[PDB]
């Protein structure tokens, strides 16, 4: 028969890279599709809707593993 | 025989054959038919070597088959052009790397095991060797 | 500080763009060109990046 | 386990107050006593504490772990908080309901001057 169909996305991964000086609201990890690979806990709580993680203060990205579940968190720390 | 009862997916990619085999030791039996060289071992060749073994040992002792034909191989029919989808699944192979113990034997004398392994090796495409259980 | 001599010995024609840019960062132009470069782990890393072409007088 | 269920009830508001950087007035309630702790937003050091097991609070009360005892502990913790000079704390239920001794402690802190 026939089985040749596919969808499209054009980004699916992080943009902030833990040295990245992201200001204001830059999407640190857009189209993660989900709050579980990365959580936002440094600059308050990101993860608005479609779980896009974004900065809330002008500063450097921070990647870290916290919690009892060994979950990965994106933080924003000041320069 | 030796086609799996179910598969998650009907067809696979062709792939490439790996470096070296896991399962190089003689584990269950006392003698083994180790593989020296790469290739794909068809289920029909596996069955033919098994029958040669079993009749050579006269259905005495116990024989282990350490490989299984879990990869479906598709072939296009005759006088059809390229494309138009992937071909129909025709037969099943096991990918063999050098060092893979293919068969195992116990409960027989060593020379009778060597004769049965030689008659199986005459049916297999790849070059094989006789190995014995070693303690480590 | 101490300086070393780096001489090109092979051509840069079929090489990778990273290899060509490493020769540009070294300062080598011709197939016999020699340069005097100050001794530094960065210069040594460029030599190790393209070491099949260069020849180093210490 | 009742303590584990209480921690599961408390955890959502505890992480929400941790993310806001809020100085938490937490309350612990037992059948015998009630405890109040104003804790700095880092969560590691306790700024102000007032407990029913403290003898100065416990001598004035007919029964420890009463609603009157909860009001006395809330008044005491708000008095020590305003003596320390800190204000604008956020109240943590710590898994309990806002009812009875917990509500009485928070109402006494609000009356004595700790604003939420």
């Amino acid at each position: 028969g026939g089985s040749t169909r596919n969808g499209r996305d054009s980004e699916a991964k992080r943009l902030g890279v833990k040295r990245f000086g992201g200001e204001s609201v830059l999407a640190g990890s857009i189209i993660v599709r989900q709050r579980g690979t990365k959580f936002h806990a440094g600059a308050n709580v990101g993860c608005g809707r479609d779980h896009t993680l974004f900065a809330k203060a002008d500063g450097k990205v921070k990647f870290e593993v916290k919690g009892p579940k060994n979950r990965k968190f994106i933080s924003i720390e000041a320069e | 025989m030796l086609q799996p009862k179910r598969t998650k997916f009907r067809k696979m990619h062709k792939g490439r054959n790996r470096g070296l085999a896991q399962g190089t030791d003689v584990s269950f039996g006392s003698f083994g038919l180790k593989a020296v060289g790469r290739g794909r071992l068809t289920a029909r060749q596996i069955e033919a070597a098994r029958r040669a073994m079993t009749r050579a040992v006269k259905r005495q002792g116990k024989i282990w088959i350490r490989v299984f034909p879990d990869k479906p191989i598709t072939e296009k029919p005759l006088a059809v052009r390229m494309g138009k989808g992937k071909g129909n699944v025709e037969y099943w192979v096991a990918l063999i790397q050098p060092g893979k113990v293919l068969y195992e034997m116990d409960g027989v004398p060593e020379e009778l095991a060597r004769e049965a392994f030689k008659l199986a090796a005459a049916k297999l495409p790849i070059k094989t060797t006789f190995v014995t259980k070693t303690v480590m | 500080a101490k300086t070393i001599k780096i001489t090109q010995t092979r051509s840069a024609i079929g090489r990778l763009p990273k290899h060509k840019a490493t020769l540009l960062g070294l300062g080598l132009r011709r197939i016999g060109h020699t340069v005097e470069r100050e001794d530094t782990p960065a210069i040594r890393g460029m030599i190790n990046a393209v070491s099949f072409m260069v020849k180093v007088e210490e | 386990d009742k303590k584990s269920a209480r921690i599961r009830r408390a955890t959502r508001a505890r992480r929400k107050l941790q993310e806001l950087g809020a100085t938490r007035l937490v309350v612990h309630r037992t059948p015998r006593h009630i405890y109040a702790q104003v804790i700095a937003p880092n969560g590691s050091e306790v700024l102000v504490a007032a407990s029913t097991v403290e003898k100065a609070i416990a001598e004035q009360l007919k029964y420890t772990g009463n609603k009157d005892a909860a009001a006395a502990v809330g008044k005491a913790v708000a008095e020590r908080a305003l003596e320390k000079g800190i204000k604008d704390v956020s109240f943590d239920r710590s898994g309990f309901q806002y009812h009875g001794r917990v509500q009485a402690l928070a109402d006494a802190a609000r009356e004595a001057g700790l604003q939420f």
Binding site: - | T24, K34, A35, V36, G37, P98, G99, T129, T134, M136 | - | -
Partner: protein, 94 residues
């Protein structure tokens, strides 16, 4: 008795180990849990003949390095996948 004459390893790595196997010797390691492990190389044909002797694994062996006798025991053997030869042995101090 099972005495093996062994030499210490000047260089470790896959290239050095393959150079040993090209020079018909093979690497080995000794560890005891009380002191630092010692990396050695062995004469492959001699240690092969001691493999073919079937009492190699049961009893206590004697490795001589620099004239020093070390009482060991064979823990595991890494064998070549499709040739008789062997690549690596680890010895536990007995």
């Amino acid at each position: 008795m099972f005495t093996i004459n062994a030499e210490v390893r000047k260089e470790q790595g896959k290239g050095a180990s393959r150079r040993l196997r090209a020079a018909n010797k093979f690497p080995a390691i000794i560890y005891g849990g009380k002191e630092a492990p010692l990396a050695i190389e062995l004469d492959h044909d001699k240690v092969m003949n001691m493999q073919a002797k079937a009492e190699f694994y049961s009893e206590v062996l004697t490795i001589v390095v620099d004239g020093k006798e070390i009482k060991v025991k064979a823990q595991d053997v890494q064998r070549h996948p499709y040739k008789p030869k062997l690549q690596h042995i680890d010895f536990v101090r007995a």
